[PDB]
Design an enzyme around this catalytic site. Sequence first.
Site, PDB file in Angstrom:
ATOM      1  N   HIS A  37       0.806  -1.213   0.000  1.00  0.00           N
ATOM      2  CA  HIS A  37       0.000   0.000   0.000  1.00  0.00           C
ATOM      3  C   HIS A  37       0.858   1.291   0.000  1.00  0.00           C
ATOM      4  CE1 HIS A  37       0.050   1.590   4.132  1.00  0.00           C
ATOM      5  NE2 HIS A  37      -0.057   0.348   4.611  1.00  0.00           N
ATOM      6  N   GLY A  62       2.643   6.081   9.980  1.00  0.00           N
ATOM      7  CA  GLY A  62       4.049   6.009   9.604  1.00  0.00           C
ATOM      8  C   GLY A  62       4.775   4.784  10.137  1.00  0.00           C
ATOM      9  N   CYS A  80       3.823   1.737   9.565  1.00  0.00           N
ATOM     10  CA  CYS A  80       3.601   0.703   8.541  1.00  0.00           C
ATOM     11  C   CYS A  80       4.934   0.184   8.034  1.00  0.00           C
ATOM     12  CB  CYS A  80       2.749   1.254   7.400  1.00  0.00           C
ATOM     13  SG  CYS A  80       1.292   2.189   7.935  1.00  0.00           S
TER      14      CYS A  80
HETATM   15  O1  RLH Z   1      -3.823   2.446   9.108  1.00  0.00           O
HETATM   16  C1  RLH Z   1      -2.821   2.978   8.639  1.00  0.00           C
HETATM   17  C2  RLH Z   1      -2.691   3.269   7.158  1.00  0.00           C
HETATM   18  C3  RLH Z   1      -3.668   2.436   6.363  1.00  0.00           C
HETATM   19  C4  RLH Z   1      -5.011   2.789   6.282  1.00  0.00           C
HETATM   20  C5  RLH Z   1      -5.925   1.969   5.638  1.00  0.00           C
HETATM   21  C6  RLH Z   1      -5.509   0.779   5.062  1.00  0.00           C
HETATM   22  C7  RLH Z   1      -4.174   0.439   5.140  1.00  0.00           C
HETATM   23 CL1  RLH Z   1      -3.647  -1.086   4.489  1.00  0.00          CL
HETATM   24  C8  RLH Z   1      -3.250   1.252   5.764  1.00  0.00           C
HETATM   25  N1  RLH Z   1      -1.761   3.342   9.384  1.00  0.00           N
HETATM   26  C9  RLH Z   1      -1.595   3.181  10.770  1.00  0.00           C
HETATM   27  C10 RLH Z   1      -0.940   2.099  11.350  1.00  0.00           C
HETATM   28  N2  RLH Z   1      -0.880   1.856  12.666  1.00  0.00           N
HETATM   29  C11 RLH Z   1      -1.490   2.714  13.477  1.00  0.00           C
HETATM   30  C12 RLH Z   1      -2.188   3.869  13.041  1.00  0.00           C
HETATM   31  C13 RLH Z   1      -2.791   4.794  13.929  1.00  0.00           C
HETATM   32  C14 RLH Z   1      -3.382   5.930  13.436  1.00  0.00           C
HETATM   33  O2  RLH Z   1      -3.883   6.973  14.179  1.00  0.00           O
HETATM   34  C15 RLH Z   1      -4.200   6.749  15.563  1.00  0.00           C
HETATM   35  C16 RLH Z   1      -5.406   7.590  15.913  1.00  0.00           C
HETATM   36  N3  RLH Z   1      -6.500   7.417  14.948  1.00  0.00           N
HETATM   37  C17 RLH Z   1      -6.740   8.529  14.019  1.00  0.00           C
HETATM   38  C18 RLH Z   1      -8.040   8.147  13.322  1.00  0.00           C
HETATM   39  C19 RLH Z   1      -8.737   7.180  14.279  1.00  0.00           C
HETATM   40  C20 RLH Z   1      -7.827   7.118  15.493  1.00  0.00           C
HETATM   41  C21 RLH Z   1      -3.437   6.173  12.070  1.00  0.00           C
HETATM   42  C22 RLH Z   1      -2.879   5.296  11.190  1.00  0.00           C
HETATM   43  C23 RLH Z   1      -2.232   4.118  11.640  1.00  0.00           C
END
Ligand code: RLH
Lengths: 299, 305
Positions: free
Chosen positions: B41, B143, B145
């Site tokens: 991705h 970030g 990932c």
């Molecule tokens: O998820 C994704 C990118 C993504 C998105 C969709 C599909 C794929 Cl395959 C990849 N990266 C993240 C990885 N790990 C932890 C995360 C934590 C994150 O924010 C914490 C607070 N959140 C703010 C919105 C609700 C609560 C944000 C992003 C994070």
Amino acid sequence: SGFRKMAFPSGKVEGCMVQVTCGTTTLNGLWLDDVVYCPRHVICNPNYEDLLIRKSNHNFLVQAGNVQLRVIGHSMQNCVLKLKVDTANPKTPKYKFVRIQPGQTFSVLACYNGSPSGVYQCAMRPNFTIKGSFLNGSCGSVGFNIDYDCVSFCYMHHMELPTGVHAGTDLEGNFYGPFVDRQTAQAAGTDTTITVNVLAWLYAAVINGDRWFLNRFTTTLNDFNLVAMKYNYEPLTQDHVDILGPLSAQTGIAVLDMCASLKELLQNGMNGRTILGSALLEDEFTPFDVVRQCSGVTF
Amino acid sequence: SGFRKMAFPSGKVEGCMVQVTCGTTTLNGLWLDDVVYCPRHVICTSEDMLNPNYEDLLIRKSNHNFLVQAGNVQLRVIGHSMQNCVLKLKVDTANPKTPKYKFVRIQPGQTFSVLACYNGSPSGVYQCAMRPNFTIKGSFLNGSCGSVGFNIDYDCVSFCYMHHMELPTGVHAGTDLEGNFYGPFVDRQTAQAAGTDTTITVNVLAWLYAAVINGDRWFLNRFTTTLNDFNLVAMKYNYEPLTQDHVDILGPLSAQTGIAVLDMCASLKELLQNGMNGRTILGSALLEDEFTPFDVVRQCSGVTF
Ligand SMILES: O=C(Cc1cccc(Cl)c1)Nc1cncc2cc(OCCN3CCCC3)ccc12
Ligand SMILES: [Cl-]
């Protein structure tokens, strides 16, 4: 999201671990530049000056991986033995020897026979002990923090107390607590909860969505400490209040407001509810740790 | 003495972390030999995320579109291929710090260390378990990932997880190092939810044996149970069924402490029935399930207190 007990990346420290052998005693040493630091009890009424004057440089068998290191001198500084060697470690990081205060946290690289086996995070308890996970042969394992790109060595493991808790020195051989390096009756005093750390962990819970413990109330610093003193909690100073400022600003909950939640959490308990997956109030995350883990600081 | 949650020394893994950039997306890559592995991705715009065709998006990319950075040195990409949900970037230089490694796929209940990175730079290391619902309860931000999960047995690093996304509940999802997801997840922004989570039973029993080895015996009782009667009570507390394999695996700990597996199961049923009652087991007021039978035997020894 997610709150875990996290240690610093141990790489810069792994490249420093060696095995020090003197007679039958075998423990770990920290090889920085051309000196190997290790607990002085490796030479073990133990008169260490009398025991060291009787030793020669060839009595110390220092092993860096599968390569033997040549000892060309030795001196003692408090409870640590400094072995001057022939080769300067090529993997020596940017380092500093620091002494920490109770409540401060650090990473432990647990070693056996000069070979790193595990890494874990812990705090210097108010009674100066550490609740580590150590076995025989772990002596000489070091506690550290990474400051930008500089490793701050703050602890060297020496012994285990009758209660399973651990005692050691800073990297200048000065013990943490009222302990001595000998087989004698020694007991860790009564332990207290690191108050500023529990409050930091309650701010980390608010940031991660856990708000059930919050209330409309507040307290004075004097009324909080009167209740804290009764629940075996470390007194919260104005410095602690000031240090919690950024977390207070980020969540919108004033420090004395969070103290009223901790006050109610002590008298009335968790009541079947958990904060950050825990049924106890956690005190091994400092205000700085919470900021670093909930911001993404790297090395 | 002492029982702590312990991660593996992260050194061998740190020397593999790089930063992979494609367009505006920037995440971490694992540089082993002359290949950099990262979540596929990275070729996605935050727009395409809902229903992206990765084959269609990769055919449109060239080797110069991928900016790989190892420390302060740029790595030149000379080829690329996709294997399931992981993108393999063939590079010009083989990593001199490549450890003896192996790609392993793990089962739920298995534990591993996570080296959390941001912009190809390691920030922290922690220990966790693959949950029965295939999620991990990590500590990840945007970030992270491409951060990897590993086990270092002997001198060989076993890569078992690569972080891809965060689910609506704060739990994390990812793949093995061959791009195969753990669980029924897809690397899409569609509506997905982690199933009901259960407690890893064999791990709680291993941790109760670790408590007996460290001196704590208060929870032990004079009762034993059948495997069927235990699982009937376990199901009721949202506990994973204990199989005969689990019973067999707990054999060495059973031998070392002298407490038969089904006897420890009765002590566990009683704990689920009564609670902790203000008492703690190994400094915990909850029953811990992220220490496998193998972790306990590793961290502890052969002398019971
Ligand atoms: O998820 C994704 C990118 C993504 C998105 C969709 C599909 C794929 Cl395959 C990849 N990266 C993240 C990885 N790990 C932890 C995360 C934590 C994150 O924010 C914490 C607070 N959140 C703010 C919105 C609700 C609560 C944000 C992003 C994070
Ligand atoms: Cl497995």
